Enzyme design. Structure first.
Site, PDB file in Angstrom:
ATOM      1  N   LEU A  15      11.279  68.143  79.746  1.00  0.00           N
ATOM      2  CA  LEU A  15      11.315  68.737  78.296  1.00  0.00           C
ATOM      3  C   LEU A  15      12.817  68.283  77.851  1.00  0.00           C
ATOM      4  O   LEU A  15      12.959  68.172  76.459  1.00  0.00           O
ATOM      5  CB  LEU A  15      11.083  69.966  77.992  1.00  0.00           C
ATOM      6  CG  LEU A  15       9.710  70.479  78.299  1.00  0.00           C
ATOM      7  CD1 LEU A  15       9.522  71.800  77.969  1.00  0.00           C
ATOM      8  CD2 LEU A  15       8.668  69.581  77.786  1.00  0.00           C
ATOM      9  N   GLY A  16      13.835  68.637  78.510  1.00  0.00           N
ATOM     10  CA  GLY A  16      15.189  68.066  78.090  1.00  0.00           C
ATOM     11  C   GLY A  16      16.447  69.178  78.766  1.00  0.00           C
ATOM     12  O   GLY A  16      15.864  69.979  79.641  1.00  0.00           O
ATOM     13  N   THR A  17      17.405  68.995  78.221  1.00  0.00           N
ATOM     14  CA  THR A  17      18.587  69.566  78.833  1.00  0.00           C
ATOM     15  C   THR A  17      19.215  70.643  77.868  1.00  0.00           C
ATOM     16  O   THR A  17      19.483  70.267  76.746  1.00  0.00           O
ATOM     17  CB  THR A  17      19.668  69.034  79.315  1.00  0.00           C
ATOM     18  OG1 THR A  17      19.278  68.085  80.271  1.00  0.00           O
ATOM     19  CG2 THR A  17      20.814  69.691  79.833  1.00  0.00           C
ATOM     20  N   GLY A  18      19.578  71.763  78.057  1.00  0.00           N
ATOM     21  CA  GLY A  18      20.224  72.786  77.079  1.00  0.00           C
ATOM     22  C   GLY A  18      21.472  73.664  78.026  1.00  0.00           C
ATOM     23  O   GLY A  18      22.073  72.959  79.078  1.00  0.00           O
ATOM     24  N   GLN A  19      21.787  74.540  77.335  1.00  0.00           N
ATOM     25  CA  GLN A  19      23.058  75.387  77.575  1.00  0.00           C
ATOM     26  C   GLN A  19      23.141  75.698  78.868  1.00  0.00           C
ATOM     27  O   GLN A  19      24.126  75.960  79.721  1.00  0.00           O
ATOM     28  CB  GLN A  19      23.190  76.505  76.695  1.00  0.00           C
ATOM     29  CG  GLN A  19      24.899  77.190  76.803  1.00  0.00           C
ATOM     30  CD  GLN A  19      26.022  76.291  76.500  1.00  0.00           C
ATOM     31  OE1 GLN A  19      25.834  75.463  75.868  1.00  0.00           O
ATOM     32  NE2 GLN A  19      26.998  76.365  77.465  1.00  0.00           N
ATOM     33  N   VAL A  22      18.468  71.916  82.944  1.00  0.00           N
ATOM     34  CA  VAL A  22      16.963  71.275  82.576  1.00  0.00           C
ATOM     35  C   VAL A  22      16.182  72.294  82.363  1.00  0.00           C
ATOM     36  O   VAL A  22      16.131  73.451  82.800  1.00  0.00           O
ATOM     37  CB  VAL A  22      16.697  70.513  83.759  1.00  0.00           C
ATOM     38  CG1 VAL A  22      15.264  69.946  83.771  1.00  0.00           C
ATOM     39  CG2 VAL A  22      17.684  69.115  83.915  1.00  0.00           C
ATOM     40  N   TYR A  83       5.333  78.000  76.313  1.00  0.00           N
ATOM     41  CA  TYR A  83       5.563  76.678  75.773  1.00  0.00           C
ATOM     42  C   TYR A  83       5.292  76.363  74.600  1.00  0.00           C
ATOM     43  O   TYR A  83       4.089  76.660  73.871  1.00  0.00           O
ATOM     44  CB  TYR A  83       4.589  75.739  76.662  1.00  0.00           C
ATOM     45  CG  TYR A  83       4.588  74.453  76.638  1.00  0.00           C
ATOM     46  CD1 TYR A  83       5.594  73.335  76.832  1.00  0.00           C
ATOM     47  CD2 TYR A  83       3.280  73.617  76.144  1.00  0.00           C
ATOM     48  CE1 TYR A  83       5.703  72.134  76.547  1.00  0.00           C
ATOM     49  CE2 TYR A  83       3.315  72.275  75.831  1.00  0.00           C
ATOM     50  CZ  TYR A  83       4.627  71.555  75.912  1.00  0.00           C
ATOM     51  OH  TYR A  83       4.444  70.395  75.659  1.00  0.00           O
ATOM     52  N   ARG A 132      17.954  74.444  65.786  1.00  0.00           N
ATOM     53  CA  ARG A 132      18.084  73.930  67.139  1.00  0.00           C
ATOM     54  C   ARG A 132      17.525  74.916  68.065  1.00  0.00           C
ATOM     55  O   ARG A 132      17.251  74.730  69.145  1.00  0.00           O
ATOM     56  CB  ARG A 132      19.795  73.273  67.510  1.00  0.00           C
ATOM     57  CG  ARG A 132      20.516  74.723  67.761  1.00  0.00           C
ATOM     58  CD  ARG A 132      21.999  74.305  67.982  1.00  0.00           C
ATOM     59  NE  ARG A 132      23.003  75.511  67.938  1.00  0.00           N
ATOM     60  CZ  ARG A 132      23.338  75.838  66.835  1.00  0.00           C
ATOM     61  NH1 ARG A 132      23.321  75.000  65.676  1.00  0.00           N
ATOM     62  NH2 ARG A 132      24.150  76.718  66.680  1.00  0.00           N
ATOM     63  N   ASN A 133      17.580  76.138  67.701  1.00  0.00           N
ATOM     64  CA  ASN A 133      17.267  77.409  68.634  1.00  0.00           C
ATOM     65  C   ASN A 133      15.825  77.953  68.061  1.00  0.00           C
ATOM     66  O   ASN A 133      15.755  79.423  68.427  1.00  0.00           O
ATOM     67  CB  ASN A 133      17.897  78.533  68.888  1.00  0.00           C
ATOM     68  CG  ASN A 133      19.569  78.064  69.569  1.00  0.00           C
ATOM     69  OD1 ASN A 133      19.309  77.116  70.320  1.00  0.00           O
ATOM     70  ND2 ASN A 133      20.734  78.495  69.233  1.00  0.00           N
TER      71      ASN A 133
HETATM   72  C1  7G6 Z   1       9.950  62.994  71.612  1.00  0.00           C
HETATM   73  N1  7G6 Z   1       9.952  64.373  71.978  1.00  0.00           N
HETATM   74  C2  7G6 Z   1      10.541  64.706  73.272  1.00  0.00           C
HETATM   75  C3  7G6 Z   1      10.588  66.123  73.549  1.00  0.00           C
HETATM   76  N2  7G6 Z   1       9.382  66.874  73.140  1.00  0.00           N
HETATM   77  C4  7G6 Z   1       9.466  68.263  73.685  1.00  0.00           C
HETATM   78  C5  7G6 Z   1      10.439  68.959  73.686  1.00  0.00           C
HETATM   79  C6  7G6 Z   1      10.514  70.384  74.115  1.00  0.00           C
HETATM   80  C7  7G6 Z   1       9.208  70.915  73.945  1.00  0.00           C
HETATM   81  N3  7G6 Z   1       9.154  72.469  74.476  1.00  0.00           N
HETATM   82  C8  7G6 Z   1      10.051  73.225  74.629  1.00  0.00           C
HETATM   83  C9  7G6 Z   1      11.458  72.858  74.826  1.00  0.00           C
HETATM   84  C10 7G6 Z   1      12.488  73.816  75.493  1.00  0.00           C
HETATM   85  C11 7G6 Z   1      13.907  73.638  75.665  1.00  0.00           C
HETATM   86  C12 7G6 Z   1      14.354  72.637  76.376  1.00  0.00           C
HETATM   87  C13 7G6 Z   1      15.447  72.007  76.611  1.00  0.00           C
HETATM   88  C14 7G6 Z   1      16.298  72.956  76.287  1.00  0.00           C
HETATM   89  C15 7G6 Z   1      16.327  74.073  75.533  1.00  0.00           C
HETATM   90  N4  7G6 Z   1      17.331  74.920  75.162  1.00  0.00           N
HETATM   91  C16 7G6 Z   1      17.929  74.700  74.169  1.00  0.00           C
HETATM   92  C17 7G6 Z   1      19.305  75.376  73.435  1.00  0.00           C
HETATM   93  C18 7G6 Z   1      19.439  76.447  74.254  1.00  0.00           C
HETATM   94  C19 7G6 Z   1      20.463  77.349  73.652  1.00  0.00           C
HETATM   95  C20 7G6 Z   1      20.805  78.441  74.605  1.00  0.00           C
HETATM   96  C21 7G6 Z   1      22.036  79.302  73.709  1.00  0.00           C
HETATM   97  C22 7G6 Z   1      21.735  80.852  73.556  1.00  0.00           C
HETATM   98  C23 7G6 Z   1      22.745  80.201  74.494  1.00  0.00           C
HETATM   99  C24 7G6 Z   1      20.429  78.906  75.721  1.00  0.00           C
HETATM  100  C25 7G6 Z   1      19.277  77.936  76.093  1.00  0.00           C
HETATM  101  F1  7G6 Z   1      18.929  78.205  77.325  1.00  0.00           F
HETATM  102  C26 7G6 Z   1      18.748  76.795  75.553  1.00  0.00           C
HETATM  103  C27 7G6 Z   1      17.749  75.836  76.047  1.00  0.00           C
HETATM  104  O1  7G6 Z   1      17.289  76.227  77.124  1.00  0.00           O
HETATM  105  C28 7G6 Z   1      14.945  74.462  75.352  1.00  0.00           C
HETATM  106  C29 7G6 Z   1      14.798  75.620  74.456  1.00  0.00           C
HETATM  107  O2  7G6 Z   1      14.756  76.931  75.251  1.00  0.00           O
HETATM  108  C30 7G6 Z   1      11.862  75.400  75.590  1.00  0.00           C
HETATM  109  N5  7G6 Z   1      10.681  75.768  75.503  1.00  0.00           N
HETATM  110  C31 7G6 Z   1      10.197  76.987  75.732  1.00  0.00           C
HETATM  111  C32 7G6 Z   1       9.727  74.518  75.075  1.00  0.00           C
HETATM  112  O3  7G6 Z   1       8.489  74.874  74.934  1.00  0.00           O
HETATM  113  N6  7G6 Z   1       8.151  70.243  73.661  1.00  0.00           N
HETATM  114  C33 7G6 Z   1       8.202  69.108  73.566  1.00  0.00           C
HETATM  115  C34 7G6 Z   1       9.145  66.600  71.884  1.00  0.00           C
HETATM  116  C35 7G6 Z   1       8.727  65.030  71.471  1.00  0.00           C
END
Ligand code: 7G6
Length: 265
Positions: A15-19, A22, A83, A132-133
Site C-alpha cells: 500500500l506504500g510507506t509511512g513513518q 511499509v 483496511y 495525510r493522516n
Molecule cells: C493509486 N493509489 C495507490 C495507493 N492506494 C491505496 C493506498 C492505501 C490504501 N489503504 C491504506 C493505507 C494505509 C497506510 C499506508 C502507508 C503508510 C501509512 N502511514 C501514513 C502516515 C503515517 C503517519 C504516522 C504519524 C503519527 C506518527 C504514523 C504512521 F504509521 C503512518 C502510516 O503508516 C498508512 C496509514 O496508516 C493504511 N491503511 C489502514 C490503509 O487502509 N488503499 C489504497 C490508492 C490508489
C-alpha cells in the site's frame, strides 16, 4: 487479547510507506480484509507502544480506523488495522475526477469531527491530525488514522518543532513557541484539515516555507477562505485558529456547528 498470530495473515499487495515503514493489504484467516504495518527496525519505541496498544484497542468509533491487534513475538512487529480501500484523504482530494460537491466536502469534515469528538471524550490526543493522516473507505467515508502514534516515533526530524518532518503548518502558536500540546492544538489542526478539504488538497501556506509560516502565524496572519467554502464554513474553520487556545471551540461545539451548516446549505 491484543495479540494476533501472524500465521493468520495472507499478504496480497503493497500500500506504500509511512513513518514506520511499509504497509500492506492482506487477509486475516483467508477472509477478512486488513492493513498490516510492518514496523521498520529502529523507527519505533516498541516497548512503549506495546503497553499503549492496550489502551488503543479500546478506542472504537465508526469514524476511527479500527486497531485489530499487534504481532509482537517477533521482529518486525506488525500492527493490524482496518483496511481503507481508497487510501489517504490528501491524495483522494487531489484527484480532480471526483468533481466533489460542497455537500460531500462538508460530510468529510463531519466524519473527522465525529472521530475527534470521540477522542476528546476519552481525553486522547491525535497529535498529528491532517488530511495525510485520514483515510477513505470504499463508501467514501473518511476516518481518522494513526492517532496517538506520534508518541512512539524515534526520528528527531519528526519530533523536533524545527525538524523537516514536524507538522509546522498544522500547529498553533503555543506549540511552535513552547511545545504546549493540548486538546486545543488538535482543534487548530482540525481547522487546517477543513481548509485542506475545501482547497482540494492544496498545501497550507503553499507559497511559504515552514520557517516563514511559523513567523506569519506568530504575527497573527491566517489561512484565508478556499473558493469552495461558504462564509458559514469559513467561520467554522477560522474559529479553530484563535490566538488564545481557551477561546477555541471543542469538538462537540464544532460538530454542532457543522450539523447546523449542513442543514442550512
Ligand atoms: C493509486 N493509489 C495507490 C495507493 N492506494 C491505496 C493506498 C492505501 C490504501 N489503504 C491504506 C493505507 C494505509 C497506510 C499506508 C502507508 C503508510 C501509512 N502511514 C501514513 C502516515 C503515517 C503517519 C504516522 C504519524 C503519527 C506518527 C504514523 C504512521 F504509521 C503512518 C502510516 O503508516 C498508512 C496509514 O496508516 C493504511 N491503511 C489502514 C490503509 O487502509 N488503499 C489504497 C490508492 C490508489
Amino acid at each position: 487479547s491484543w495479540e494476533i498470530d501472524p500465521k493468520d495473515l495472507t499478504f496480497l499487495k503493497e500500500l506504500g510507506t509511512g513513518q514506520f515503514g511499509v504497509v500492506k493489504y492482506g487477509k486475516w484467516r483467508g477472509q477478512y480484509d486488513v492493513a498490516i504495518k510492518m514496523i521498520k527496525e529502529g523507527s519505533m519505541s516498541e516497548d512503549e507502544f506495546i503497553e499503549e496498544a492496550k489502551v488503543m484497542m479500546n478506542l472504537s468509533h465508526e469514524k476511527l480506523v479500527q486497531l485489530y491487534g499487534v504481532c509482537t513475538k517477533q521482529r518486525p512487529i506488525f500492527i493490524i488495522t482496518e483496511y481503507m480501500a481508497n487510501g489517504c484523504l490528501l491524495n483522494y482530494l487531489r484527484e480532480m475526477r471526483h468533481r466533489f460537491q460542497t455537500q460531500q466536502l462538508l460530510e468529510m469534515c463531519k466524519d473527522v469531527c465525529e472521530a475527534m469528538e470521540y477522542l476528546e471524550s476519552k481525553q486522547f490526543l491525535h497529535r498529528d491530525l491532517a488530511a495525510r493522516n485520514c483515510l477513505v473507505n470504499d463508501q467514501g467515508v473518511v476516518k481518522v488514522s494513526d492517532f496517538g502514534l506520534s508518541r512512539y516515533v524515534l526520528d528527531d526530524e519528526y519530533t523536533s518543532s524545527v525538524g523537516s518532518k514536524f507538522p509546522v503548518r498544522w500547529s498553533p502558536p503555543e506549540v511552535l513557541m513552547y511545545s504546549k500540546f493540548s486538546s486545543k492544538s488538535d482543534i487548530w489542526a482540525f481547522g487546517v484539515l477543513m481548509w485542506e478539504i475545501y482547497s482540494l488538497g492544496k498545501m497550507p501556506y503553499e507559497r511559504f516555507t515552514n520557517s516563514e509560516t511559523a513567523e506569519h502565524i506568530a504575527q497573527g496572519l491566517r489561512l484565508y477562505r478556499p473558493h469552495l467554502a461558504s462564509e458559514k464554513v469559513y467561520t467554522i474553520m477560522y474559529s479553530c485558529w484563535h490566538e488564545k487556545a481557551d477561546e477555541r471551540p471543542t469538538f462537540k461545539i464544532l460538530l454542532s456547528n457543522i450539523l447546523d451548516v449542513m442543514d442550512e446549505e
